[PDB]
Design a protein around this ligand. Structure first.
Ligand SMILES: CCCCCCCCCCCCOCCOCCOCCOCCOCCOCCOCCOCCO
Ligand SMILES: [Mn+2]
Ligand SMILES: [Mn+2]
Lengths: 449, 451
């Protein structure tokens, strides 16, 4: 029923303490409303636990994201919209790890350059809400780090013990993804046989067979000539969790720096990116690579201010700007943002989020996304970058290794009536096994010279 | 004082196949020694939670270990197994885990050079949270401490009661530790040169440094040679003691035939007090695919040793069974030879491993249970003298160590005394070799290994 843990370390450098305290004294949107004394007790437990990631892996990610920023690699970021403790199981994790590897080999062939793989995993347990009371009149579900999905009042109370449950689930998952990435799942030939089974059994396989066959000949060629790292990420939302997981280490200049060891990279969402808020200030104090989500109310001028605050030393790949405009708005809204930022001399990664600007409620009462709109935003994103001569750096996608019925369309041609089949997401609709693979194939075509 | 963390009750996955479960049932119907006395319905509730969690290890890693252990049994590799006697939840921290991983990597590079063949590294880590006790009642009049998977070290009645929620807390700690071990072995510690730079800092600052300096300099010259010519795996292990934990962690994988693996570790061993030939622990080791070890003490007969080979290695797979000698330094040269002769004649290929710690324990006048470095060294040496004389392979060592400057074992370069023991005796059970004493042993066994 309950685990019991008793409460009964070296100080930070004086300047890092001052800066951390100042970041956390700024106002913060979307925080849990639990008591400060209970939060503090939970953070004290987390301050001594083994970290989810280590500094050397974060420094290595930074070097790989620098190549992406310079136009010599591509970033694939993907996973569940919301991880749940309930589905934090071996089959679910393996299914997502495999999906990401499958998409990555397809994208690598299309881009003709390395693909950096960042999973939404081992921490994606918190979400923001526009309304604190939902459609059933209950306090809103804010992810398993905060409260329960169950539609009852007791379940929806904010519960600080979920910080520690979140850590435990994150460690366990990350342990498995490390294991899985040094196993036979690694092998590029095994990973691509899955894609060819997908081509054989998919209703739209004829659309993708030529490209699947060409990839298979590239792999066999490589072998005829004599011839896996998955990073963890989540939205840095709950500051009690992120601050508890900070650790001091010597950074890429040999001086002690603060690393958030809850993940390798984190991003700041649309509702928490206040320029003078705690999330942006917290991002300025940590050594991790960071991303900021940019929606349709973004100005070129605010985008530059984010770049100058978050990438003050002009470190290629330290900052990612994640575009989510809507498929009908991206072609008009993005170019002015890109031009103004390019002119600063900084090298950010431009990443497309084709999911969050394109959501709508179906007549059957399910929030859903159409495949054609998702594809069209990624396409428009590539067009904006071709015209300006800039690098389309990656995609940020929400997916699952399960055959869910959540997003409309694809090869399966999922309808409004089919959405009830198994709509399993705890939050936003995921592209299923098939639809995620389809998009990787379509984006690989977009990447071709 | 303490916080209560809810154990989420989550949906079950498919059950294990019916045929394999029937066989597991027959096996666990045998009597099991040294088990927790918590209620069966509470135990069942916690097993059900553990049956659906992500595993600590995966099958492909275990079949890789079996391949490397096969090389050890054939005389082509050497086994290094070491870590804390008792892992605690309180010391399951980054610095402590990093100190133990580093110590293992430091010992392994020195042993690799001396043996002239690969060294397989198995940590006592990520699950060594349970132990037997001979005593009903300890010296304070309390129920005995049984390790963190069972009860608390603190000397009070409430802490000492058997708490099945500690099964789940043990899993969380094991998972978190393993995650860090995986990260550390693909990090800067992977560098052979970095690891041996710590060995040469050891030679520079040790009082006995002159004893190891020639050999340290030689290893450094070998690494630089390798570099001049143009030119990362640590496994988890523990004593399989608490069957509620080990059975909840069984998972299906494929010989080609469906099989159970214990995915709480890569390899497990059966101790001196639970190795009853007709008991549940040996029966459990029969059913699982993992490589296994059995501890063998002074009361072992060559005949009972042969009964272990026939129970635990029916298919004659080299390296599947490791027999772990712990005789006492004064008894090893007399007692071990006939056991080895009898086993070799069966035609099976076991790994012969030395445990020089557990046969050599004694209590000081100052009241601390401790071990003398000279007795520990003398048993590994006697172990090497036995195998040389029979023409068999001294397959590895099983040692209890830590990466901190503790005062638990007497002797070494620092010449730790009975008075020094009270400085920092930090073990939750047996006296461990500290950072320095561990390294010294590795250097001396490197000399033993030299051709
Ligand atoms: C799939 C995950 C399983 C869910 C488990 C839920 C409840 C268990 C969570 C509590 C355990 C978290 O880890 C902390 C428990 O032990 C405390 C100390 O061990 C950690 C090291 O910290 C050092 C303390 O000094
Ligand atoms: Mn989402
Ligand atoms: Mn011991």
């Amino acid at each position: 029923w309950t685990v019991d843990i008793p409460i009964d370390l070296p100080p930070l450098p004086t300047d890092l303490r001052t800066r951390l305290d100042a970041a956390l004294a700024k106002p913060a949107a979307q925080q849990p409303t639990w008591p400060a004394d209970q939060a503090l007790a939970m953070r004290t437990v987390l301050e001594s636990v083994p970290p989810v990631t280590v500094p050397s892996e974060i420094v290595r990610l930074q070097e790989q994201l620098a190549q992406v920023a310079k136009g010599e690699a591509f970033l694939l970021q993907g996973g569940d919209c919301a991880e749940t403790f309930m589905d934090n199981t071996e089959p679910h994790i393996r299914g997502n790890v495999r999906a990401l590897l499958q998409m990555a080999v397809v994208l690598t062939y299309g881009a003709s350059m390395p693909v950096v793989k960042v999973a939404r995993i081992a921490g994606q347990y918190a979400k923001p809400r526009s309304a604190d009371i939902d459609a059933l009149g209950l306090r809103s579900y804010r992810g398993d780090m905060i409260n329960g999905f169950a539609p009852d009042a007791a379940a929806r109370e904010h519960d600080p013990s979920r910080l520690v449950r979140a850590y435990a689930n994150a460690s366990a998952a990350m342990n498995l993804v490390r294991a899985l990435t040094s196993s036979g799942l690694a092998s590029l030939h095994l990973v691509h046989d899955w894609n060819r089974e997908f081509v054989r059994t998919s209703p739209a396989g004829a659309r993708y067979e030529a490209l699947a066959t060409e990839i298979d000949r590239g792999l066999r060629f490589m072998s005829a000539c004599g011839v896996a790292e998955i990073y963890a990420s989540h939205e840095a939302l709950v500051l009690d969790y992120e601050r508890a997981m900070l650790r001091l280490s010597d950074g890429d200049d040999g001086e002690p720096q603060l690393f958030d060891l809850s993940a390798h990279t984190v991003w700041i969402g649309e509702r928490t990116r206040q320029i003078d808020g705690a999330h942006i200030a917290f991002a300025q104090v940590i050594a991790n690579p960071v991303g900021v989500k940019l929606g349709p109310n973004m100005t070129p001028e605010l985008a530059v201010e984010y770049v100058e605050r978050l990438d003050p030393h002009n470190k290629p790949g330290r900052l990612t700007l994640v575009s989510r405009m809507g498929n009908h708005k991206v072609r008009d809204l993005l170019p002015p943002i890109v031009e103004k930022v390019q002119a600063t001399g900084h090298q950010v990664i431009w990443q497309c989020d084709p999911m969050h600007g394109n959501t709508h409620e179906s007549s059957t009462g399910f929030k859903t996304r159409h495949f054609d709109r998702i594809v069209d935003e990624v396409q428009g994103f590539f067009e904006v970058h071709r015209a300006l001569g800039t690098h389309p750096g990656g995609i940020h996608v929400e997916i699952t290794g399960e055959n869910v019925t959540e997003c409309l369309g694809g090869a399966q041609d999922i309808s409004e009536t089919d959405l009830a089949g198994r709509y399993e997401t705890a939050c936003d609709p995921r592209l299923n096994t098939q639809q995620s693979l389809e998009l990787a194939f379509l984006v690989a075509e977009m990447l071709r010279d």
